[PDB]
Amino acid sequence: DPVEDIIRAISSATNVESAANTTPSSHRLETGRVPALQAAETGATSNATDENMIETRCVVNRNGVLETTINHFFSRSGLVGVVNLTDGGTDTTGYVTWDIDIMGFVQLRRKCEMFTYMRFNAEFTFVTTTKNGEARPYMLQYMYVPPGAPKPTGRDAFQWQTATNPSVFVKLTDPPAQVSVPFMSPASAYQWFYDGYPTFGQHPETSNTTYGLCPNNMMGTFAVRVVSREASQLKLQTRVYMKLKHVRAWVPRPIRSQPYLLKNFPNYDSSKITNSARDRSSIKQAN
Amino acid sequence: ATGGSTINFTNINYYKDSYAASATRQDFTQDPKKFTQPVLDSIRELSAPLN
Amino acid sequence: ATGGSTINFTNINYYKDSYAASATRQDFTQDPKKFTQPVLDSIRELSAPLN
Amino acid sequence: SDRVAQLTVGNSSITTQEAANIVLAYGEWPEYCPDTDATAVDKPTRPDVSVNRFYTLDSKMWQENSTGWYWKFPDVLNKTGVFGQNAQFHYLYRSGFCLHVQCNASKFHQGALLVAVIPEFVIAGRGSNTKPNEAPHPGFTTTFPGTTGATFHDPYVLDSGVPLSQALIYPHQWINLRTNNCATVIVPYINAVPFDSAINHSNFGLIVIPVSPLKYSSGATTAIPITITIAPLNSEFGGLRQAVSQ
Amino acid sequence: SDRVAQLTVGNSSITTQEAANIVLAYGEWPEYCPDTDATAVDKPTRPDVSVNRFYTLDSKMWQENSTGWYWKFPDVLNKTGVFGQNAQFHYLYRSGFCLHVQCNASKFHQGALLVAVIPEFVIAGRGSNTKPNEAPHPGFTTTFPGTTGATFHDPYVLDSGVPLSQALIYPHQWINLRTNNCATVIVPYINAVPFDSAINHSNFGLIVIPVSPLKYSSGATTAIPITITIAPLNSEFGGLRQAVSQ
Ligand SMILES: CCCCCCCCCCCCC/C=C/[C@H](O)[C@H](N)CO
Fold this sequence. Notes:
The PDB classes it as virus. Keywords: picornavirus uncoating, receptor binding, virus. The structure is cut from a larger assembly and holds one copy of chain A, two copies of chain B and two copies of chain D. By secondary structure, chain A is mainly β. Chain A is about 5% helix and about 25% strand.
């Protein structure tokens, strides 16, 4: 009472179960009404349509729109990692850890990077074979070591007691292991691009190795062993396939045309930039 | 269409957890107007954009 | 939330024994006041404890 | 009723006689953080008219060889006005922006500028090194240019390794010297967390690029600047402490 | 809501940002032949979208000495598209037209063009001979120029012996380079018979003439073309037979 100055989105949603129909349109002879002329300086795309440009027939369109949703586009398993467990003769560790980063393999990386923010679940399958290829009847242990948890120091070391860490016991002759994983980010979404630094302080101008590394993506480590006492002589790879499910996506961004170099960095060649479209002989020959 | 009395069951879940389940329930929702035409003053297709 | 018509079944047991089953039914019950404040005379947060 | 606009924010205001609509990024307005999304318990501060208002950077001059410039937000504003002070004494920042770009010339000039808004805009090292040890990275003065802005080494791939032609996915507009002399975009707060540190993290960069180069026939004006004026709509600050510039 | 127009006919369409209304010749639209006026008993053919649409001739280039050009209709279209084929296989043709003329130049140019539509436009021999034997006549390539158009020897008397100043009786428009860059006239079917032979008889000619000559000061663009785009509204054909080009 004594001091008065103290006292939405335009876009909406619509279900689309099939491709758009086409209504019939005849010609137009008159002034003042001009569907063709656009001005792109407003950042908005041309709203001109089939039916105001030419004369059209009527098309009932039963083409399905369904397969292109982000759920169906992103729910497929593809390789996020490869782990090499020697365990054999000579120098023998007896186990191998793999930090969980799905940016290590390009084919599934470029699909994710269409988007800035993502919130999903996961389905991991572990396909393990021997050096060339085979399956023998050896028991395996796949253990998840979340951030802050002790990493195992040896084949038999006590960190494999896994009274808490989830683990999978499986034989090489069994069908590949599989589990469901939740959304574990301490933020509200995963983000594949973080423009910023994780901590305060003075940042070197010569080499910034901390630029662009989001803390919220550090999920812990995956570790393998052969359950045993002495050692085996075999040598095996485990391939790791991640499926995305229940996925949501935000803020689409352009698709990367340059060859990747590093996992965690978008470094590209200042020399050698490859053109996004192949070159022809002349602009006047379509072919 | 068709498929008379096919008794489909998928989404039934065997675990006490929601993320154990299987996609989707789909979604048919679209809003292209936020990416394609994100302008304050609405512009009709008949009128010229700039007057 | 969500999960419309997901038809969940877990606690169904295949044996005649109760301990054969699977956890949990959960529990949301808490009583911190027995460990945290186990005093005869109740003390408010406003008042000073000792008068 | 279209090409003429006035924008009034705080004690500042902007008029333009030549304008192409206004872009509202992703169809939302800036807003204060709702009680359901918030996490930090302490009470944020809301200066309103002292922070939210138009700040005007220096002008970038416009040449035939120019490859284009970029800025980072809030970073450009962290040293200026009362907005720069609040962001130093608080650990938690949230707000949107209203971006306005002025470039004018005369009916005998020509060119076009792409103005975009890129959420989480990550610059990229330039080199053939595939080892994360020997591989180059950009410097802090590059990643976060400040008021002085930065420039593109490779404007075609946007210095991030991504084609410029697809930049039209971001909220954008063009300055086409025959059509409009300004471009205005109103950006909501975008981030994967409700609040963040204005110092460590920049939400989005701004980009001005010559897709079509400046041309003028001799005798006309050679000096064309590009001025930038940005206002922080709907600001909040939390986690009050001592002052940290970086 | 006036100077900007779009015309859509068939799979073709025309936009113009600078236009002076539209002329509808003699206050009528083209139409199909009514049952009461018709005579021939057989059923006409009506292709609609395949014939009715904008065809675009070559451009006539525009000079200081130019005396002006003319065309004949349907004759210009008898060799082109599906319209040219139907007119060869049928003995009986009827339709209207929509005529559009494009000439543009820059605010430092000047001139004016008279665009008219002349029903039953008869060219005339030029000579003093009063004996119908020794008296000269024009050639077929002159009477019916084709796509390539023809030119006036005497644009003042319109080559027919009639003053140009009174050509404003016909449906017309001007291209005045300071005002409009196009002229559009919509011609109904005019003739003393409901159908006729497209090959032997041309209903009307089109005329573009420089009443005021083109002028530009040195350094501006010397090359100005004049383009013509014409659409056959409401076409019918009858009397189907073998093909006759003439
Ligand atoms: C029994 C073994 C189970 C293994 C469980 C591992 C689950 C880890 C969570 C995976 C979620 C996606 C991974 C995170 C995203 C990207 O990798 C980030 N760039 C990491 O830096």
